[PDB]
C-alpha cells in the first residue's frame with residue numbers, strides 16, 4: 001500500500017483530497033479528515049491555498065491523541081503557494097503551514113504550480129482583464145530553497161505539482177542539484193491520462209500523483225460546464241457494472257494499476273468509506289485498454305485567467 005520515494009521515504013498510494021470550495025464551512029474539513037483516517041486513509045493532501053490547514057492538522061492531532069494512529073503512520077502534504085516562489089519566502093511559507101497545522105514537519109512539501117505570481121497579500125493578484133499578474137522567478141532558485149527546507153527537517157520530502165516535462169527537466173538538470181523532486185502532482189484521469197509525462201517520471205524515479213482523478217469538483221471559476229462529466233462516462237459505467245463496483249472506484253483503480261499514486265476528495269461519509277475499496281479488486285488488461293481509450297486531452301482546469309501565464313504548463 002506504499003511506494004518508495006527516490007529519497008528513501010515511503011508514500012501511501014491512496015491519498016485523501018481535502019480541498020472544498022469556500023461556500024463549504026471551514027469546520028467540515030475537521031470532520032471529514034477524521035472520517036478519512038477512520039476509513040483507513042493515511043496520506044492526507046492539503047495546501048496553503050485550501051484555507052483548511054488548521055482544521056486538517058487538528059483532525060490529525062485528534063486521531064493521534066486518542067490513539068487511532070501515530071504521527072509516523074500519517075503522510076501529510078502541504079504546498080507552497082505561487083506568490084511565495086521567491087526563495088526568501090519559501091521557508092517562512094512552510095513554517096506558517098506548520099504553525100497552522102500544529103505539526104513539527106510535513107511529510108511532503110510541493111511547489112503548488114510553476115506559474116509564479118506577484119508577491120503580496122492577495123492569493124490571486126489579477127490585472128483589469130482578469131489574467132493573474134505573473135512574476136518572473138527562476139524556479140531553480142525556488143527549488144534550492146525547498147532543498148534547504150528538507151535539510152532543516154521541516155519537510156521529510158520535497159516535490160512539485162503541475163510541472164510539465166520541460167519544467168521538470170529544468171530542475172533535474174540544475175547544476176549542483178541536491179534532491180530530485182520525489183513526485184509531480186498533476187491533473188490525471190481517463191480523459192487526460194498523462195501517458196507521456198508518466199513515462200518520463202518513471203524514467204527518472206519520480207512518482208506521478210493524480211489529482212482530479214474523479215473528474216474534479218467542476219468549479220465554475222476554472223471548469224467549462226460543457227466538459228463531459230468523468231463519472232458519467234459510459235465506459236466507466238459499464239466497467240463498474242461488470243465488476244459490481246462504482247465508476248469512481250474504476251477511475252481510482254485505473255491509476256493504481258499504472259503505477260500512479262491517486263488522490264480522492266470526498267466530504268461524504270459513505271463515499272469516503274467507499275473509496276478505500278480500491279484495494280479490494282482488480283481491472284483486467286482489456287479493462288485498462290478500454291479506459292486508455294478515453295484519453296481526450298481534457299484538462300478540466302481551463303481558464304483565460306491562467307492560460308496566458310508565461311509558465312502555463314499546457315500547450
Ligand SMILES: NC(=O)c1ccc[n+]([C@@H]2O[C@H](COP(=O)([O-])OP(=O)(O)OC[C@H]3O[C@@H](n4cnc5c(N)ncnc54)[C@H](OP(=O)(O)O)[C@@H]3O)[C@@H](O)[C@H]2O)c1
Pocket residue numbers: 016017018019020045046112161162185186210211212213214215216217231246248249263264265266267268271272274275
Ligand atoms: N496540485 C493541485 O494543483 C491540485 C489541484 C486540484 C486538486 N488537488 C488535490 O486533489 C484532491 C482531489 O481532487 P479534486 O478535489 O479535484 O476532486 P476529485 O478527487 O476529482 O473529486 C471528485 C468529486 O468526486 C466526488 N466523489 C468522491 N468519491 C466519489 C465516489 N466514490 N462516488 C461518486 N463521487 C465521488 C466528490 O464529491 P463528494 O465530496 O460530494 O463526495 C468530489 O467533489 C483535492 O481535494 C486536492 O487535495 C490538487
Ligand SMILES: COc1ccc2c(c1)c(CC(=O)O)c(C)n2C(=O)c1ccc(Cl)cc1
Pocket residue numbers: 019049082112113115187212215216217218219222299300301
Ligand atoms: C481540475 O483542475 C483543477 C486544478 C487546480 C485546482 C482545481 C481544479 C480546484 C477545484 C478542484 O479541486 O476541483 C482547485 C482548488 N485547484 C487549485 O487548488 C489550484 C492550484 C494551483 C493553481 Cl495555480 C490554481 C488552482
